[PDB]
Amino acid sequence: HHAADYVLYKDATKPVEDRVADLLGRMTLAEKIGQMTQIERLVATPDVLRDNFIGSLLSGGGSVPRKGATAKEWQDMVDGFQKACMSTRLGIPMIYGIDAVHGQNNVYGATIFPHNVGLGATRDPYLVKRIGEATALEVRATGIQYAFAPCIAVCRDPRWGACYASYSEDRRIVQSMTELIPGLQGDVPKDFTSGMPFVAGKNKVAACAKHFVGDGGTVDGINENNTIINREGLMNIHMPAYKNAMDKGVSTVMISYSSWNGVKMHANQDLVTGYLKDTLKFKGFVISDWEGIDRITTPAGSDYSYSVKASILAGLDMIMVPNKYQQFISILTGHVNGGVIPMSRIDDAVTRILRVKFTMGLFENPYADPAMAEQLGKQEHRDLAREAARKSLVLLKNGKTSTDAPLLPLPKKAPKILVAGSHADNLGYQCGGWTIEWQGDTGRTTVGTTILEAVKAAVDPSTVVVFAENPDAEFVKSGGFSYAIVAVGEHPYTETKGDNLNLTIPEPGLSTVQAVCGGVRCATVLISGRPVVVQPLLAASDALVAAWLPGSEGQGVTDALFGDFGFTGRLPRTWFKSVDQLPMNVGDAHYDPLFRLGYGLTTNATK
Ligand SMILES: *[C@@H]1O[C@H](CO)[C@@H](O)[C@H](O)[C@H]1NC(C)=O
Ligand SMILES: *[C@@H]1O[C@H](CO)[C@@H](O)[C@H](O)[C@H]1NC(C)=O
Ligand SMILES: *[C@@H]1O[C@H](CO)[C@@H](O)[C@H](O)[C@H]1NC(C)=O
Numbered sequence: 290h291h292a293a294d295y296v297l298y299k300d301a302t303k304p305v306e307d308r309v310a311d312l313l314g315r316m317t318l319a320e321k322i323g324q325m326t327q328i329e330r331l332v333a334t335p336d337v338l339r340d341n342f343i344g345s346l347l348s349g350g351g352s353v354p355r356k357g358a359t360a361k362e363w364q365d366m367v368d369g370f371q372k373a374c375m376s377t378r379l380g381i382p383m384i385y386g387i388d389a390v391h392g393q394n395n396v397y398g399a400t401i402f403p404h405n406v407g408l409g410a411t412r413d414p415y416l417v418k419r420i421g422e423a424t425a426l427e428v429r430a431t432g433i434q435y436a437f438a439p440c441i442a443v444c445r446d447p448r449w450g451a452c453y454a455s456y457s458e459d460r461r462i463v464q465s466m467t468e469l470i471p472g473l474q475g476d477v478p479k480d481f482t483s484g485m486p487f488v489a490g491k492n493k494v495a496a497c498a499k500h501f502v503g504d505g506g507t508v509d510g511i512n513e514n515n516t517i518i519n520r521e522g523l524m525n526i527h528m529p530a531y532k533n534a535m536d537k538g539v540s541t542v543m544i545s546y547s548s549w550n551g552v553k554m555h556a557n558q559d560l561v562t563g564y565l566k567d568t569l570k571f572k573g574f575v576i577s578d579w580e581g582i583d584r585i586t587t588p589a590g591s592d593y594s595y596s597v598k599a600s601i602l603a604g605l606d607m608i609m610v611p612n613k614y615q616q617f618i619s620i621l622t623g624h625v626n627g628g629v630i631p632m633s634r635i636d637d638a639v640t641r642i643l644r645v646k647f648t649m650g651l652f653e654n655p656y657a658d659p660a661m662a663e664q665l666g667k668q669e670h671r672d673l674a675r676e677a678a679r680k681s682l683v684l685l686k687n688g689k690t691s692t693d694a695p696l697l698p699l700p701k702k703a704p705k706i707l708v709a710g711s712h713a714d715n716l717g718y719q720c721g722g723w724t725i726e727w728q729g730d731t732g733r734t735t736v737g738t739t740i741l742e743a744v745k746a747a748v749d750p751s752t753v754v755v756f757a758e759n760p761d762a763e764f765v766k767s768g769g770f771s772y773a774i775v776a777v778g779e780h781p782y783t784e785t786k787g788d789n790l791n792l793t794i795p796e797p798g799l800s801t802v803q804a805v806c807g808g809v810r811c812a813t814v815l816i817s818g819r820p821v822v823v824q825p826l827l828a829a830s831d832a833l834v835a836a837w838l839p840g841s842e843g844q845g846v847t848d849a850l851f852g853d854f855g856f857t858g859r860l861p862r863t864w865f866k867s868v869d870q871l872p873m874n875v876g877d878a879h880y881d882p883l884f885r886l887g888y889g890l891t892t893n894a895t896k
Contacts, residue, residue, distance in 0.1 A: 290302075290303075296311075297311040298311040298312035298315075298647075298652075299380075299652070301652070301653050305644060305647045305648050306644075308643075308647045308652075309640055309643045309644050309647060312379065312381070312643055313636060313639055313640060313643065315379065316379065316639065318622065318625060318635070319341075319342055319618075319622070320342045320377075320378075320379060320381075321635050321636070321638075321639045322342075322618055322621050322622055322625075322635065323341050323342025323343055323344055323618070324342070324344035324381065324607075324638075324639045324642045324643065325344060325601075325606060325607050325608060325621070325635070325638050325639065325642065326341065326343055326344055326345070326607075326608060326610060326614055326617060326618060327343075327344065327345035327346065327347055327386070327576070327607055327608060327609045327610060327611060328343055328345075328346055328347075328610055328611055328612070328614045329346070329347060329348075329349060329352060329610075329611040329612055330346050330347070330348055330352055330366070330370070331352055331612070332611070332612050332614065333346055333370055334373075335369075335372075335373035335376075336373075337614070338370060338373040338374050338383065339373050339374070339376055339377055341614060341615075341618060342377055342379075342381075343374065343383060343614070344381070344383060344384070344607065344642055345383055345384045345385070345386060345435075345607060345642075346370055346383055346385050346386075347385065347386040347387060347609065347611060348385075348386075348387045348388075348395060348433075349388075349579065349611065349727065350388060350395065350723060350726060350727025350728070350783070351395065351725070351726045351727045352395070353395055353396070354366045356397070357397045358396070358397060359662070360396070360398075360430045360431050360661075360662035360663075360664075360665040361659065361662050363396065363430075363431035363432055363433070364430075364431060364432035364657035364658075364659065364662065365432075366432070367385050367431070367432035367433060367657055368432060368656050368657050370383060370385065371383060371385075371655050371656055374655075375655060381643075381646070382646065382651050382652060382655035384434050384435050384495065384645070384646060384651060385432070385433045385434055385435060386433070386434075386435035386436070386437055386495075386497075387428070387433050387435070387436065387437065388436075388437045388438075388723055389424055389427070389428045389433070389436040389437070389438060389494075390404075390405075390436075390437065390438045390439075390440065390454065390723050391403065391404050391405070391720075391723065391724075391838075391840060392423075392424055392427060392670075392674070392840070392841075393424065393427040393428050393430070393431060393433075393665070394720075394723050394724050394725070395725065396427075396431055396665065397725065397735055397736075398665055398666040398735060398736045399427050399431075399665055399666055399735070400423065400427060400666055400667070400670040400671050400673075400674050400840075400841060400842075401674065401720045401724055401735065401737060401840035401841035401842075402420050402423075402424070402673075402674045402677055402840045403674070403677050403678050403681045403837060403838060403839045403840050403845075404453045404454065404721055404818060404837060404838040404840070405439070405440060405453065405454050405455055405456045405466070406444075406452065406453045406454075406455060406456070406457075406818060406819060406837050406838070406861060406862065407677075407678070407681030407682075407836070407837030407838065407839060407858075408420070408456055408466060408677065408681060409455070409456035409457040409462050409463075409466065409861030409862070410680070410681045410682075410683050410835075410837065410858040410859060410860065410861045410889075411677065411680040411681055411857075411858060412462070412465075412859060412861075413680060414465045414466055414468040415468065416673075416676065416677055416680060417456075417466045417468050417469050417472065418468040418469065418471060418472040419472065419673055420469065420472065420673065420674075420677060421468070421469040421470065421471070421472015421473040421474075421496075422472045422473075423667075423669075423670040423673055423674075424436065424438075424472070424473060424494075425472065425473045425474070425492065425493050425494045426492065426661070426664040426667075426670070427664055427665055427666070427667075427670065428494050429491070429492055429493075429494065429657075429658070429661050429664065430661045430662050430663070430664040430665040431657075431665065432656075432657030433494070434494055434495060434649065434651060435494055435495040435497070435540075435541070436473055436494045436495070436496060436497065437497045437499060437543060438469060438473065438496060438497060438499075439466070439467065439469040439470065439496070439497075439498060439499070440454040440455065440499055440500070441456075441463050441466075441467065441498050441499065441530040441531065441534065442454060442455045442463075442499075442500065442504045442505035443455060443457070443458060443459075443460050443463050443505040443506070443526055443527055443530070444457075444458055444505040444510075444819075444862070445458055445505055445506050445526070445872055445874055446505075446507070446509065446510035446871055446872040447510065447792065447819035447820050447862065447865070447871070448509060448510030448788060448789055448790055448792065448868070448871060449505065449507065449510030449511075449512060449787075449788060450510075450512050450782055450783065450784050450785055450786060450787020450788040450789065451504070451505075451512060451783070451784050451787065452505075452510070452787075452818060452819040452862075453721065453722070453787075453818030453819060453837070453838055455505055456861060457861035457862060458861070458862045458863060458874060458886065459861070459875075459886060460525075460526050460527075460529050460530060462861055463529075463530045464529055464530045464533045467498075467530055467533040467534050467537055468537075469496070470496050470498070470534055470537040470538070470539050471537050471538075473493065473494050473495075473496040474487055474488045474489060474493050474494065474495065474496050474537075474538065474539075474540065475487065475488060475489025475490070475493045476489075477537060477538040481538060482570075483532075483535045483536045483569075483570065484535045484569055484570035484571045484572050484573075485538055485572050485573075485648075486538060486539070486540035486541070486572060486573035486574075486644060486645045486648050486649075487537075487538030487540065487648065488540055488645075488648060488649035488650070490649075490650050490654075491650055491653075491654040491658060492661070493649070495540035495541060495645060495649055496539050496540055496541070497539070497540070497541045497542065497543050497576070498530075498531055498534035498539045498541075498542050498543075499542065499543035499545075499578075500543050500544060500545035500546070500547070500554075500578060501531060501542050501543065501544050501545055501554065501560070501561070501565060501575075502523065502527050502528055502531065502545065502549070502554065502560060503516035503518070503523055503527040503545065503547055503549050503554075504516075504545040504546075504547050505527065506518055506522075506523075506526065506527055506547075507547055509790070509871075510788060510871075510872075511788055512546075512784050512785040512787075512788050513546035513547060513584070513784075513785065514547060514548070515547070515548045515549075515550075515551060516547050516548065516549050516550075517550060518549075518550075523549060531565070531569065532569060535569050535570070535571060539573065540573045540574070540645045540648070540649065541573050541574050541575070541576055541645065542565060542571060542573065542574075542575050542576070543575075543576050543577070543578055544561065544575065544576070544577055544578060544581055544605060545578065546578055546581055546584055553584070553585045553599075555577060555578075555581045555582050555584065555585050555596075555599070555600050555603065555605065556585045556599040556600060556603050557603055558602060558603040558604060561575060561603045561604035561605065562603065562604035565604075566604055572641065572644060573641060573644070573645050574606040574607050574638070574641040574642045574644075574645050575604060575605050575606045575607070575641070576605070576606065576607045576608075576609060577600060577605050577607070577608045577609045578609060579609050579611060580609075580610075580611070581600075581609065582596040582597060582599070582600040582605070582608060583596055585599055585600065593613075593616060593617075593620060594620050594624075597617065597620045597621050597624060598624055598629060598630065601621065601624070601630055601634060601635075601638070602630060602634065605638075606637070606638035606639075606641045606642055607638070607642055666736055671841070671842050672842075674840050674841060674842040674845070675842035675844050675845045675848065676845070677840075677845065678836075678839035678840060678842050678843075678844075678845025678846060678848075679845040679846070679848040679849050679854055680845075680857060680858060681836070681837055681839060681845075681858050682834050682835070682836050682837075682839075682845070682846065682849050682856055682858045683834070683835040683856075683858040683859060683860055683888075683889045684697065684832070684833075684834055684849075684856040684858070684889060684890040684891070684892065685823070685827065685833045685834065685835055685864075685884060685888075685889075685890065686827055686830060686831075686832055686833040686890070687831075687832045687890050687892065688831065688832070689831055693831070695832075695892070696772065696810055696811075696812055696831040696832040697812060697832045697849075697850060697852070697856070697892055698849075698850065698851055698852025698892055698894075698895050699772055699774075699812065699850055699851055699852070700771075700851075701747060701748050701749050701752065701851050702748070702749035702751060702752055703748075703749075703752050703771035703772065704751075704752070704753065704769070704771060705752070705753040705755060705768070705769050705770055705771060706744075706748070706752060706753070706754055706755070706770055706771050706772055706773065706774070707755050707756075707757065707760070707765065707768060707770045707772075707773040707774070707775075707805065707809065708740065708741050708744050708754060708755070708756050708773070708774050708775075708776075709756070709757050709758065709759070709760055709773055709774070709775045709776075709801060709805050710758065710759075710775040710776040710777045710798070710801050710802070710805075710814075711758060711759070711776075711777055711795075711797065711798060711801070712740070712776035712777050712778050712798075712814070712816045713739065713740045713741050713756065713758070713774070713775070713776040713814075714739045714740065714741035714742070714756060714758075715731060715732060715739060716732065716733050716734060716735065716737045716738075716739050716841065716843075717729055717730040717731045717732050717733075717734045717781060718731060718778070718780065718781060718816060719737075719739065719740065719816055719836075719838065719839055719840070719841075719843060720734070720735075720737070720781070720838060720840055720841060721779070721781045721782070721816075721818055721838035722781050722782050722783030722784075722787065722818070722838075723783055724781065727783060728781060728782060728783050728786060729781025729782070729783070730781060731780075731781070735841060736841065737840075737841030737842065737843065738841070738842060738843040738844055739843050740774065740776050740814060740843045740846055740847070741754075741756050742843060743843040743844040743846060743847040744774060744847055746844065746847070747844070747847045747850075747851050747853075748851075755768065755770070758801075759797050759800075759801050759804075760801070760804060760805065761804055762804045762807050762808055765804060765805050765807070765808030765809055766807075766808040766809075768808075768809075770808075770809045771809070772809060772810045772811065772812065773805045773806070773808075773809050773810070773811040773812070774811070774812050774814060774850065775801060775802050775805045775806070775811050775812070775813050775814070776813075776814040776815075776816060776836075777794060777798030777799070777801060777802060777813070777814075777815065777816070777826075778794055778798065778815050778816030778817045778821070778836075779794060779795070779816065779817045779818060779821065780795060782818070787818065790868060791822075791868060792819070792820070792821045792822055792865075792868050793821065793822045794815075794817070794821050794822070799825050799826060799829075802826055802829050802830060803825075803829045806829040806830050806831065807829070810831045811829075811830055811831055811832075812830070812831065812832040812833070812834065812850060813826055813829070813830040813832070813833045813834070814834050814836050814846055814850075815833060815834065815835050815836060816836055816837070816838065816839075817835065817837065817838070818837065818838055819862070820835075820862060820863070820864040820865060822867075822868070823864065823883065824866075824883070834846070834849070834850075834856075835858075835860075849892070851895065852892065852893075852894055852895030853894065853895070854894055855891055855892045855893045855894050856889065856890060856891050856892045857889070857891065858889050859887050859888065859889040860884055860885070860886055860887060860888045860889060861886070862886065863875070863880075863882045863884075863885060863886050864882055864883045864884035864885075864888070865882065865883060866881060866882070866883045
């Protein structure tokens, strides 16, 4: 189509499938295996990226150009990697992925949205779509084109350390919240074939439905473990939202560390190829989890040759290595050279990877847009996060007896009030895991508003606000306080570090609530990624709110405490009476909840 040096795959006017086929037909085995290889930025250099024809890079949790890096520092880092990839013989751009799972959360100054369990409490799919839209903009502000979200796990046991990453124990709620996908990617057109990948253009990102499949169903909630359930239960609980993700054009799917009835998902040809590809007609790319193929074996990494053969034959397309790319590339090249892995399997993996890259516009816009930098932490997105935080709150108690005056909403004008607890003025605790660091962190780790700061912003100027982190009973009784707001709960965690068989909050938390509430009427705000043992907190408190992990916008909590809005959140999970009941789900013979799925008290906005 015209100029003497015309190359069809470089022609932006050609159909995607024609561009894929034209490029694939020109590639060497080294160029094909390179596309299937994703590496950490920590091991990337210009020569590594060119010499190994690398297809993708990622930042793991906390993998950043430096602490406090600006949006432009991120764009310059990503573009430097891209310039190296674009300089190869074929000039195939790399795709850069990151865990943007509640905002662009590794990045300083990014808006931090509530974690998924609180979003499930909102029952508001359109809110979650808007959160996807804002998240795409803040990810593109940093030059990154690919977000590893949504987690569509259906967490069936809150002892799991990733329960907060699940919208709900009820698959129907998880299905509803797949609206995150067209938020991040853009809406698919009217014509659209389920299972095809879609991203609208340079202001959107590729999404990732994860982790396929049954990651929320593991024995005792043990992370990365075995999910024991018949096919009927797998298909009835854990699978449905993957079909909604196909219908919405999700570009990629990430495989689970978990096993299904003893078969590693990373080695499961029947599910990855037979079901996801051949039954659901998924045409995007399938990516491993981090060292996911290493973990097929016990011990992990003890037969990496088998890990590569089993995973690639199972149908995985792109491997998140993420460090030992030389070994990965060498073993896979040997398997192909030996006839153990057919060329047809390599060509399928590369076809899918290229299909996603051409579809999303990456060959047309491989570099960052400096004009997008200011999207990072934009006030409109903070207002959205504040809306979501407020909608996520579930009021569990509002008065000790049926005849007491309800404590909430609290008055903004009072002579003197107390704000207390470990979680009242700790931005890292209110954001939880996957915030700045992989495991999250403590204190003022990014830009945001703590519960204490939100209270000071909300109250009448005549209201004196006193903060004490862990006051004793006498300090409270002598203080002349009108009421107290006391915030306690879990410390930040992610995945295995969060697996927890007792689900009791760290001390001092309960002791502080008891000291405070013993001296003055108190509203307890519980920060957690899941239900935790709650009867002692309830017995002490006049009012108690499950605020989950509400993110950077602490004013969402005070918006409801002071009656600017009514409480509307409803439990997206069962609240247990004791951990010895677990697992305990609706329909079980022993279903005996402290609070059932859907429970939530309400208030009306103050007049
Ligand atoms: C589950 O965890 C146990 C206990 O640590 C371990 O022995 C086992 O290998 C795990 N099983 C799977 C399938 O991951
Ligand atoms: C509850 O489990 C957590 C994490 O496994 C642990 O750190 C904490 O000390 C436990 N409390 C107990 C065993 O009483
Ligand atoms: C809250 O609104 C509902 C419905 O209008 C009403 O039934 C209730 O009495 C209202 N006010 C209070 C303070 O409960």
